[PDB]
Design a protein around this ligand. Structure first.
Ligand SMILES: O=c1ccn([C@@H]2O[C@H](COP(=O)(O)OP(=O)(O)O)[C@@H](O)[C@H]2O)c(=O)[nH]1
Ligand SMILES: [K+]
Ligand SMILES: [Mn+2]
Length: 503
């Protein structure tokens, strides 16, 4: 055949698919009807996301009481406590969560500890989740993770077994469902071949049609200037079920918007997937480096084995990191040199990977730039970038750049796990507001200026702030004109600010 098999793999594990996830996937089926579309689900992990939420609520309740019993708690003290509390709940033998039966029993016990209407709040959620899975199982497009691991274990039981253990660790030890998906996508491609995309990506569009309209005209590229706004307007015009775009607007002109709506209506905007050579491994790097959010290879790909092997090695080293209790600066070099010699690594190039292991149980709990998180180094884009470099895969022609999917969608800006909008003090103070803990004058000024910095950094686009930050801003008075103008401008792009923009 000489082309990669026309399989389009997606992954959604840990709970029902959100409406906007189903909506994005249908766009892919609409544009690539001749592909075999497979969304991998795990019917043995129906309640992981809901368990995650119950643990976070218990964590926050414990954090409020910690703050109630300790003023002068610093931001660093707060997040150390947040990480320890999370571990204590996940490790608690009275609250097992290794399967859906244990999770359900544990979710009820946590909801009963929270009081209020939390019992019926979780009871209805459990039932809604079961109904969603019944429709999925009974109502083709879905395939089962257990059948996937079984199939891969008949090809490579060694790697199948090691990867399944890592998958289950991300499911249960951290509950980081994006990181578990970092594993599943590699197994899917290595077992069956095809193309993989994250569920928040959308097909590329025909930029030649855009240019031929003359409405979108540089020490920059057209995509970097216009793609985010165009993809907002495409989704807004399609009125995708579950979309956030009913409350968001772009900065494009009426004429620009009409042209996008026309091209979208004509069904002449999205491009179908290109053919890919069967003996090559494909990703894209045209946005901030290589990403594992979009991938393509045939089954039994040699570079894929090297990628899997490095991820498996990453977890062997993390296990040594935890047991050795490596914390301080000096202890990390006694570790980095020891690991570079134990596994034949280049210590100079590993200088960033080892320190990120400290963040393994801080991801999703402590604010951090995405490039500093453990997840990116363990299983995500940064390990992909490393293996491509180490294997010299580009020069050797075994990895190539390919335009698979666009990162410029509305949903890509909403991470299921990463937190990098507010850091340190401001993030600490924002949680206090969420906990109904009054701020002093100093904490108020810091959080207020931080909110306006985030808004101002957005320039001519919507700023997606947490609901509690909006409620914080609505409790304030005596805004300056510069600040008020920022809020009026923000209301032009998002309905979140409608109240803040009213005099
Ligand atoms: O509850 C979840 C959250 C994420 N994912 C998977 O993880 C991928 C990446 O998620 P996300 O876009 O939130 O991660 P980010 O791009 O922010 O790292 C998704 O496309 C899914 O395949 C999943 O299966 N369940
Ligand atoms: K997302
Ligand atoms: Mn994403």
């Amino acid at each position: 055949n000489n082309f990669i098999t026309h399989n389009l793999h997606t992954v959604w594990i840990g709970g029902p698919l959100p409406d906007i996830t189903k909506s994005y996937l249908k766009v892919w089926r609409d544009i690539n009807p001749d592909y075999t579309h497979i969304t991998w689900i795990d019917t043995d992990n129906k309640f992981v996301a809901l368990y995650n939420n119950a643990v976070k609520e218990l964590r926050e309740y414990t954090l409020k009481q910690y703050l109630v019993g300790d003023s002068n708690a610093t931001a660093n003290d707060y997040y150390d406590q947040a990480v320890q509390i999370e571990r204590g709940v996940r490790e608690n033998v009275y609250l097992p969560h290794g399967n859906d039966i244990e999770r359900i029993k544990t979710i009820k016990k946590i909801a009963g500890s929270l009081g209020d209407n939390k019992v019926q709040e979780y009871r209805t959620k459990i039932e809604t989740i079961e109904s969603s899975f019944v429709e999925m199982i009974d109502g083709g497009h879905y395939q089962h993770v257990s059948a996937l691991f079984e199939q891969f274990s008949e090809m490579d039981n060694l790697r199948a077994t090691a990867l399944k253990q890592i998958y289950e660790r991300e499911i249960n030890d951290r509950g980081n469902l994006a990181a578990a998906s970092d594993i599943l996508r590699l197994v899917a491609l290595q077992t069956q071949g095809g193309v993989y995309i994250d569920t928040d990506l959308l097909p590329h569009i025909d930029w030649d049609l855009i240019e031929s309209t003359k409405l979108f005209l540089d020490n920059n590229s057209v995509e970097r200037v216009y793609s985010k706004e165009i993809y907002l307007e495409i989704e807004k015009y399609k009125q995708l079920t579950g979309s956030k775009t009913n409350k968001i607007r772009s900065g494009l002109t009426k004429s620009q918007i009409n042209e996008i709506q026309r091209l979208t209506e004509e069904n002449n905007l999205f491009k179908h997937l290109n053919e890919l050579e069967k003996n090559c491994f494909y990703s894209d790097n045209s946005v901030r480096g290589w990403t594992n959010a979009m991938l393509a290879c045939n089954e039994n790909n040699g570079f894929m084995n090297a990628l899997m092997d490095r991820i498996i090695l990453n977890y062997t080293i993390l296990d040594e990191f935890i047991i050795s209790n490596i914390v301080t600066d000096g202890e990390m070099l006694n570790f980095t040199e020891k690991m570079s010699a134990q596994f034949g690594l280049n210590a100079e190039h590993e200088g960033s990977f080892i320190p990120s292991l400290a963040n393994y149980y801080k991801d999703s709990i402590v604010p951090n730039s995405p490039q500093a998180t453990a997840t990116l180094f363990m299983t995500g884009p940064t390990v992909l970038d490393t293996v491509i470099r180490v294997e010299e895969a580009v020069r050797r022609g075994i990895v190539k750049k390919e335009a698979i999917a666009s990162l410029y969608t509305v949903e890509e800006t909403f991470s299921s796990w990463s937190i990098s909008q507010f850091y340190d003090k401001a993030a600490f103070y924002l949680d206090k507001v969420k906990f109904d803990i009054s701020l002093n004058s100093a904490e108020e000024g810091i959080l207020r200026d931080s909110c306006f910095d985030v808004i101002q950094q957005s320039k001519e686009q919507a700023t997606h702030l947490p609901d509690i930050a909006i409620k914080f801003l609505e409790s304030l008075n005596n805004f300056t004109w510069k600040q008020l103008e920022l809020l009026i401008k923000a209301s032009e792009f998002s309905d979140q600010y409608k109240t803040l923009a009213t005099l």
